[PDB]
Design a binder for this molecule. Sequence first.
Ligand code: ADP
Lengths: 97, 381, 69, 39, 51
Amino acid sequence: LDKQIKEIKEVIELPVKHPELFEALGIAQPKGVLLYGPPGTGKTLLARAVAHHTDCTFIRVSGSELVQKFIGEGARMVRELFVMAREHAPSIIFMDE
Amino acid sequence: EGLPKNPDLRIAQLRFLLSLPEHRGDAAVRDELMAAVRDNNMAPYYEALCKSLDWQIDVDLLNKMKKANEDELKRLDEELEDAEKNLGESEIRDAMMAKAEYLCRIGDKEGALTAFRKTYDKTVALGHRLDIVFYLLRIGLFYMDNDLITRNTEKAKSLIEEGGDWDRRNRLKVYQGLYCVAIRDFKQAAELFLDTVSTFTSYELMDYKTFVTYTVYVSMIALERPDLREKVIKGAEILEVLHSLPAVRQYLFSLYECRYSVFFQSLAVVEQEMKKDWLFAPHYRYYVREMRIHAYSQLLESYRSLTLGYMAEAFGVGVEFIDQELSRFIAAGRLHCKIDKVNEIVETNRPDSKNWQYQETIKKGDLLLNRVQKLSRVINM
Amino acid sequence: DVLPPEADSSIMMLTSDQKPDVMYADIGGMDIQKQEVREAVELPLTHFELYKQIGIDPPRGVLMYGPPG
Amino acid sequence: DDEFEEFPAEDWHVWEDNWDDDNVEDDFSNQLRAELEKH
Amino acid sequence: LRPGRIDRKIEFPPPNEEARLDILKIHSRKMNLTRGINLRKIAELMPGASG
Ligand SMILES: Nc1ncnc2c1ncn2[C@@H]1O[C@H](COP(=O)(O)OP(=O)(O)O)[C@@H](O)[C@H]1O
């Protein structure tokens, strides 16, 4: 999946490494990626690979209560992960269905 | 398929041939080397080779190759800068790895090494790091840089340990066996070659025919009779490739089943090709001596006494020649017998292995004690 | 002080007496499950060298899930 | 430190270094060929 | 799905024959493969399979 590597590279790598190409173009930096595909076709694989190569902190969100104390003890809201994401920015928050 | 033949070892083979005194002037070897040089635009390597071999520099060809190389380097530096500015880390790495690859393809050792070090610094993939390390190892084989070889071998082992790429582990086994053959470590060369005989894929170094030839040679000179029987004489892949090979199969099987004097024509022909080969060249005398000693020991082991006449008849050689050879080896201490000359007869004996182990211990301890004492003088004062 | 790593509340079974009396002969059937459990827990405990040599990574944990009984 | 100029000077392999490869002798191929020819 | 949120939607379909061959090569790099295995043949034999 090389064309897919290329697209994810654009939308993830370029905004965080070269936030000047988008400024010159005059378009807001992309901030949302969604990966179609049957199970085990490389979605999580490519997300992790792009995060690793870009040096972004890959934060996997799954809703498990086993990690709710790590997110925040009184986690009545899912946006409380954003403090962690900001602290470890640049960050890539990955959800899987 | 194998890794790319960027530092083509065939070029090193041809250079070694042209360095030999019976081929310093070989028209075919020179023409093929020049074909490779003009096809790969080896301008720096061509200049260095002309200097070393005293040839006359073909100024026109050298200038055209130099212009081609300069154009390529300029274009590829432009690509690298474009990747720096616009594209991302992967594109940067690809461009600068291509620069290192071309610096190899034009035989520029130092520039290629520096480019590879920079690429390894800027690379994040373990497999790509292993590719760079194998590039460096092939450069080390090409230029017989022992320090480079050992450093990159340790680096490759460390990189493989994590990741556990068995394909890369087998490739490193082949490379390390080649290095062991180069440095005359035939025991480890045979061990690695027998490990990787059924999984050989490194065609960047040499063909499977040559690989099996080297494996058979090192196995004969290193392994004992039981191990040789189990590995070489019965390995299915070795037997098939030896069916393809008419000569080395005869050599190995003659040694194994005691057909003597045919072992010696085989040893003569293999010695000639060993001398021709760049990898085995500064060990052919040692290999032949060791193989002759092995044959004599094999013949003498199963007999309390054996007339020099019978020895000569078995080996096809004359009595005087076999007597002098046997006496030389006995004086060297690598044969467990003595020879009575008034009535020619070779009488064997069985010295306990404790004596051999004591002699080896004294020798190795003397080497290490000399090293330790040298270190002591270096430090204390 | 540092104690020997044998301080523990969960003691091994005294194989002399606590060992169960069941056998693969007493089980019967379920050969697929028996073979999977073998290759997961028993073979790698005496052939881990073979596993590493052929390139497999032995697993720890098998979970034996399924209906009751 | 000292260059040891008292004495004049004359203008000027990781394997085990053994004194057996030094023997002056024709290739074993040549030796065997001679032995067979005179045989 | 509102056309203002997902800045990009990539598609990872089931691997082609070539993609399956590439995946097989990558995942077999880490084992003793006897010399001369037709990974292309294996990929062809397993159609409609994921990585
Ligand atoms: N395109 C691919 N190339 C190599 N391996 C793949 C690919 N797609 C999937 N895999 C393998 O499949 C396994 C599971 O993939 P996964 O990342 O879970 O995909 P998904 O996120 O779509 O479920 C991984 O171990 C991975 O090595």
